[PDB]
């Protein structure tokens, strides 16, 4: 019976620690995944804006070519 | 010098335990300061059974007060007889048990149990000849139920050859604090089946009914309920506290009352129960003593059979008439006493009456009808356990559902065992 009493309280400790461990790991996964997703969305937005700048440079360069002729 | 060590655990155990020491201190002439102011040597003849003698002719109760909360024990220390208890015998935690058997038995009470055993060891070392222990507790809460049975198991481990006696308060939906009381009671009953020699089953359902139906109290309180317990506890311990020949010690009481080791749960009864100056005759005491309305277990004696009976009469009365009335009840209702235990009714008489009464009678019955109490708890247990309701309070403390299943089976075996000897 003393052995069973030790096993019960150790089981309660193990489950409480496992709950803390699962909560910490799940949150860290979510915060890291969210950080990557938001940065990816911002990176895609900036890349499109940079492509607009590249298009504008092409347009302005195209005007100089025709002005020479 | 056959000493008894008293332990009270939890809210109910301490509140009932405090009233018990208040009642018997008055009977033995001990004032709240521990000084003797009686007028009869019969009060001090067996005073060492429950009291230690200190410097200055002071009588200190051999009582250990245990709780996982300081609240109730603080009230006891501030109560009428609070100062009479030994200050070092107050062992208490702070977290509490939350009406949870697992907390009292496995997690919260485990942290505190060793310090209680140190006080038990200190009290036992000074005993010339220790009879054993008496415990007051409830089975429906967490501390008295969970930690109380933990204490019993550990005390039996350290003192295997001593008698374990308990006053166990059974839960009831009529007087209920939480829905988990059937869980706590069922878990505790199996501990009592294995690790106690004598258990007085005090049913809060019976105490409420007596206060309501008999004493005409429309709104009974715990104080009213504990008044019945105090009177019952004084009566059942009369043979231990005063000179006598019958059931004078715990072991001899167990030999007379327990024909089979697991069937040691007693139905206590008290008379008179008056809602008051009228003198009560010896025939009236005997009729009320055996009446179901004066039983503290809420079991109908006519639904079962008496294995053994102990009767105690207190006051200046005709012992010849007591014998006639006791033989009259047995001879007029012999169908309710088992025929395979001859002369199973033993009667004792004490000259000193309880406070406020000229005549009193205390009933101690080992009846197979006590199975009704265990059936009632079992039905309430199963109604929730079949849906695993409220189990998370216990699995959160490390317990598994299998332990509940085993406790359920153990009490059903106890019920079946009582039914075996009711038909034999
Ligand atoms: N007769 C009686 N029963 C009580 C008293 N206090 C609590 N109870 C019962 O005991 C159960 C609750 O147990 P409790 O002692 O309060 O829990 P614990 O302090 O953790 O051991 C419930 O079934 C109540 O009906 C009391 O003063 N007298
Ligand atoms: Ca702690
Ligand atoms: Mg309580």
From Swiss-Prot, chain A:
Is rRNA-binding one of the keywords UniProt gives this record? no
Q: Which residues form a coiled coil?
A: 1-69
Q: In which tissues is it expressed?
A: Nervous tissue.
- Gene Ontology CC annotation, any one: growth cone
Keywords of the record, alphabetical order, are:
Cell projection, Coiled coil, Golgi apparatus, Lipoprotein, Palmitate, Phosphoprotein
**Location within or outside the cell:** Golgi apparatus; Cell projection, Growth cone; Cell projection, Axon
**Annotated region described as Disordered, given as residue ranges:** 50-69
GO biological process terms, semicolon-separated: microtubule depolymerization; neuron projection development; regulation of microtubule polymerization or depolymerization
In its UniProt record, a GO molecular function of this protein is:
tubulin binding
Family, per entry: Belongs to the stathmin family.
Q: What does this protein do?
A: Exhibits microtubule-destabilizing activity.
Q: What is this protein called?
A: Stathmin-4
Q: Which taxonomic lineage does the organism of this UniProt entry have?
A: Eukaryota, Metazoa, Chordata, Craniata, Vertebrata
Q: Which gene encodes it?
A: Stmn4
Report where the shown chain sits in the full-length sequence: first residue, last residue, total length: 119 to 187 of 189
Curated annotation (Swiss-Prot), chain B:
Q: Which organism is it from?
A: Bos taurus (Bovine)
Q: What GO MF annotations does this protein's record show?
A: GTP binding; GTPase activity; metal ion binding; protein heterodimerization activity; structural constituent of cytoskeleton
Claim: Metal-binding is one of the keywords in the record: yes
* Modification sites for Phosphothreonine: 55, 281, 286
Family as reported in the entry's similarity comment: Belongs to the tubulin family.
Q: What does this protein do?
A: Tubulin is the major constituent of microtubules, a cylinder consisting of laterally associated linear protofilaments composed of alpha- and beta-tubulin heterodimers. Microtubules grow by the addition of GTP-tubulin dimers to the microtubule end, where a stabilizing cap forms. Below the cap, tubulin dimers are in GDP-bound state, owing to GTPase activity of alpha-tubulin. Implicated in neuronal migration.
Quaternary state and interactors: Dimer of alpha and beta chains. A typical microtubule is a hollow water-filled tube with an outer diameter of 25 nm and an inner diameter of 15 nM. Alpha-beta heterodimers associate head-to-tail to form protofilaments running lengthwise along the microtubule wall with the beta-tubulin subunit facing the microtubule plus end conferring a structural polarity. Microtubules usually have 13 protofilaments but different protofilament numbers can be found in some organisms and specialized cells.
Q: GO:BP terms for this protein?
A: microtubule cytoskeleton organization; microtubule-based process; mitotic cell cycle; neuron migration; positive regulation of axon guidance
Q: Which residues carry this modification: Omega-N-methylarginine?
A: 314
Against InterPro entries, the record matches this protein to:
Beta-tubulin_BS, Beta_tubulin, Tub_FtsZ_C, Tubulin, Tubulin/FtsZ-like_C, Tubulin/FtsZ_2-layer-sand-dom, Tubulin/FtsZ_GTPase_sf, Tubulin_C
Chain segments annotated as coiled-coil in the UniProt record: none
Q: What is its main location?
A: cytoplasm
Gene Ontology cellular component annotations, sorted alphabetically: cytoplasm; microtubule; microtubule cytoskeleton
- Motif, MREI motif: chain positions: 1-4
Protein name, entry field: Tubulin beta-2B chain
> Where is the PTM N6-succinyllysine found along the chain?
58
**Residues bearing the modification N6-acetyllysine:** 58
Q: Which residues does this entry mark as bearing Phosphoserine?
A: 40, 172
Q: What is known of its domains?
A: The MREI motif is common among all beta-tubulin isoforms and may be critical for tubulin autoregulation.
Q: Which residues bind Mg(2+)?
A: 69
| Cofactor(s) required, per the database record | Mg(2+)
Q: Where is this cross-link: Glycyl lysine isopeptide (Lys-Gly) (interchain with G-Cter in ubiquitin)?
A: 58, 320
The signal peptide, as residue positions, is none
């Amino acid at each position: 019976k003393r052995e069973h009493e030790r096993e019960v309280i150790q089981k309660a400790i193990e489950e409480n620690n496992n709950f803390i461990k699962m909560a910490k790991e799940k949150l860290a996964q979510k915060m890291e995944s969210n950080k990557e997703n938001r940065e990816a969305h911002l990176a895609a937005m900036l890349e499109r804006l940079q492509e607009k700048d590249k298009h504008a440079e092409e347009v302005r360069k195209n005007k100089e070519l025709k002005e020479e002729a | 010098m056959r000493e008894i060590v008293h332990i009270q655990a939890g809210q109910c155990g301490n509140q009932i335990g405090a009233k018990f020491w208040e009642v018997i201190s008055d009977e033995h002439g001990i004032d709240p300061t521990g000084s003797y102011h009686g007028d009869s040597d019969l009060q001090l003849e067996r005073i060492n059974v429950y009291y230690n003698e200190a410097t200055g002719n002071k009588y200190v109760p051999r009582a250990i007060l245990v709780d996982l909360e300081p609240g109730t024990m603080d009230s006891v220390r501030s109560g009428p007889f609070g100062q009479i208890f030994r200050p070092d015998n107050f062992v208490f935690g702070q977290s509490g048990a939350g009406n949870n058997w697992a907390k009292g038995h496995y997690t919260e009470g485990a942290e505190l149990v060793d310090s209680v055993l140190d006080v038990v060891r200190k009290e036992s070392e000074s005993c010339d000849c220790l009879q054993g222990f008496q415990l007051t507790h409830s089975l429906g809460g967490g501390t008295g139920s969970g930690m109380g049975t933990l204490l019993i198991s550990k005390i039996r481990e350290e003192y295997p050859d001593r008698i374990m006696n308990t006053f166990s308060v059974m839960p009831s939906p009529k007087v209920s604090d939480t829905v988990v009381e059937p869980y706590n009671a069922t878990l505790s009953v199996h501990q009592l089946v294995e690790n106690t020699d004598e258990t007085y089953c005090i049913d809060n359902e019976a105490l409420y009914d007596i206060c309501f139906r008999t004493l005409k109290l429309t709104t009974p309180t715990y104080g009213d309920l504990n008044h019945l317990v105090s009177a019952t506890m004084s009566g059942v311990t009369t043979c231990l506290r005063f000179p006598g020949q019958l059931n004078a010690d715990l072991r001899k009481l167990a030999v007379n009352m327990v024909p089979f080791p697991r069937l040691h749960f007693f139905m206590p009864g008290f008379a008179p129960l008056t809602s008051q100056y009228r003198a009560l005759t010896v025939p009236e005491l005997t009729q009320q003593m055996f009446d179901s309305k004066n039983m503290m277990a809420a079991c109908d004696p006519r639904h079962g059979r008496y294995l053994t009976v102990a009767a105690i009469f207190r006051g200046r009365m005709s012992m010849k008439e007591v014998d006639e009335q006791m033989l009259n009840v047995q001879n007029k209702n012999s169908s309710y006493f088992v025929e395979w235990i001859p002369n199973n009714v033993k009667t004792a008489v004490c000259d000193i009456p309880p406070r406020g009464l000229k005549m009193s009678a205390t009933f101690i019955g080992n009846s197979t009808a006590i199975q009704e109490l265990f059936k009632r708890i079992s039905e309430q247990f199963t109604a929730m356990f079949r849906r695993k309701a409220f189990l998370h309070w216990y699995t959160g403390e490390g317990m598994d559902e299998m332990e509940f299943t085993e406790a359920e089976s153990n009490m059903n075996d106890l019920v079946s065992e009582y039914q075996q000897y009711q038909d034999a």
